[model samples]
Target: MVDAFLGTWKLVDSKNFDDYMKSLGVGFATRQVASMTKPTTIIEKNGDILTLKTHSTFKNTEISFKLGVEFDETTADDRKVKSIVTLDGGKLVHLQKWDGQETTLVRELIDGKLILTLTHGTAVCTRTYEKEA
Candidate 1:
């Protein structure tokens, strides 16, 4: 089924923003403002090709690829890594592979909230996001 839910949606806000940034090695100074800033996420899903554009007042980042395929990823802030994003069962499973390691993050929505899970090593970080409109 072509999921209507599978389209570009703007990012409104998130609670665990700090933690998510920390996991990505984002500096403290940036974290403070990043956590408070309202960013927009542009998600595109066509057939099996998907792209996510994350835009903020300070920075903008986009990730585009086909489902089940692995590709290289470089953040807007300038970090390079490998990533593979695919839908599993009904949940969005996102994985980032770098060096010889891999990290997984899942996204789901509930009660008008966007939940994100980051799994690296034995630690997991769960972030929540609110709808913009």
Candidate 2:
């Protein structure tokens, strides 16, 4: 189930990323850097545990959790929430809830490229990444 997403991915482009960041209340300076910085996604799975690492010049974030299990998550923007990831077909759907707010993130492979969709409030963004050779 995880074979399709087990490689490193490089960010290629983003749609409505700035607005999505603003929805998270990201600071001006950080948002500026985040919007321009390209992040790398590395996914590793060992048995039932999965680790997702997002690396960038500005900040690096990592989350390791068992599929379908809820765990504490502190996002890059410092939002604390309970996050759970479930596999729906070939896509990984992640749900986060904090302070009555909910965010949905979906990651899937599209024609050998990775497409990550994030939705929070009224903001929705799609970030495309290509698999690293």
Candidate 3:
């Protein structure tokens, strides 16, 4: 199930990401910088703990927690958010809430590629990734 996401993945394609940021009330400069950087996703597990991380030239985020537990997270846009992650049928579902606003990210493996669907209100973005090396 969650084992599928254990490897490192590199972003290969993105669609509507900038608009998604806009829906989250992000500024023009931050949105431009976000859309220009490709992030590497890394997933790891130790005992009942799971770590989901993203690395990029602009920023790096690493969160260590257990399933179904909520934690504090700082977004790439520098927003402080309450975050939680869950797994449903092998797909990792993540939710972030901040200042009465929320967003969702559903990550799954499809045909050896990592497909991340990000949603904020009516704006939805799809980011595709392939395994590194």
Candidate 4:
């Protein structure tokens, strides 16, 4: 169930995030800053509504939406998009589209670790987070 995804997660490792941001055309300065930032993600679900929050020294972003319903979203980098989150198998899949471009984020919990995968264009970024004690 989605209950497994409802918890506080702290970032521990990231891979290929630079190119992931690069694929989205993030500026050099922002990418550099983002690369160095370790963000914490907190997810909470109540019935059909799910809230996801990401916090970092650079910036913090929060979004709330119902499953299977599309909603407007502004990315942390200030990109506007239409977003939807759905459950696929045991993974939480999020889709964001802007300017005819799309990014898909897949999140799963394994071995008490939260694994986040973001795919945009040909670039893929993977981040791992640990559940807070």
Note the clash tally of each candidate: 2, 0, 0, 0
Better TM-score candidate (1, 4): 4
lDDT, candidate 2, 12-126, per-residue tens: 9999988888998898899899989999999999999999999999989999999899999999999999999999987999999999999999998888899999999899999
Q: Given candidate 4, what's the lDDT at residue 40?
A: 89
Q: Distance (Å) between predicted and true CA of 115, model 4?
A: 0.7
In the range 14-40, model 4's lDDT, one tens digit per residue, is 999999999998999999999999998
Residue 63 deviation, candidate 1, in Å? Answer: 1.7
Candidate 3 ranges with C-alpha deviation above 4 Å:
none
lDDT (0 to 1) per candidate = 0.69, 0.93, 0.90, 0.94
TM-score head-to-head 2 vs 3, winner: 2
Clashes of 4: 0
Candidate 4 structure lDDT: 0.94
Each model's TM-score, in the order given?
Answer: 0.77, 0.97, 0.93, 0.97
Regions more than 4 Å wrong, model 2: none
Give candidates' CA RMSD values in order.
2.7, 0.8, 1.2, 0.8
Identify the runs in model 4 with alpha carbons over 4 angstroms from their true place.
none
- Tell me the lDDT of model 1 at 95: 82
